[PDB]
Amino acid sequence: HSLRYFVTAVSRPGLGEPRYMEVGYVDDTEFVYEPRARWMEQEGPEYWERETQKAKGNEQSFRVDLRTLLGYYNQSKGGSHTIQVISGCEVRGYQQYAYDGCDYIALNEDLKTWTAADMAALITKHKWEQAGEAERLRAYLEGTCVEWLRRYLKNGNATLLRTDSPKAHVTHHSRPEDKVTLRCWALGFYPADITLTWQLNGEELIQDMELVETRPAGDGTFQKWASVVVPLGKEQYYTCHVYHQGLPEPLTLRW
């Protein structure tokens, strides 16, 4: 189980100030300054305010950042520019910066040393040591992050650990000139991490499969599917293997 924040600072010039957000996920799950994972409501006001205040403080802080980087990049006060950050811990600690899509700054395996991606972040790195944020950080991560992280589940290990198993079935679709395209399916399962793979006589089939990015449904559950194009009459040679965590044993189907 883990807790991560995903920060977003996007300068849309002429269009006001930068749109900034802060999001939380215990694991792949959203939760938060109106919180959006119900069980979190179990926290009061004087939580939500020391908190929101924070966003305002960063909204304000990145505002500088957003700018200082044009600085560092010779850039312009022209187009948009986006800064993202991922700060969070497991129970590996995250503090990851990207700017515009490209990697920027990062905290390495033993959080005490960074890694920049270019002359830029390079002269953001060299400062943070002249300001030891390596440690200003080390703590939080090891420190309070975990405290919140654990001090969180408790308010929802009810769903923050639930696990509705996936429900497969395989379809049969004709392909011109004697070929049929089998489609194993995978509905209503959570978490979204699943693994659907076809097999022809026990051989994996990761050469001509056609998986679909595991898509969400609208009710926590997820759906996904893997497709194979098999010659006519010769289906029962090809089997589908579903492996999801809330599954005593991985499934297996033939249609």
């Binding site: 924040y5 920060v7 802060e22 908190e51 960063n58 944020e133 950080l137 939080y140």
Partner: peptide, 8 residues
């Protein structure tokens, strides 16, 4: 429950 980052 976020952290506070030192301007770049």
């Amino acid at each position: 429950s976020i952290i506070n980052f030192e301007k770049l």
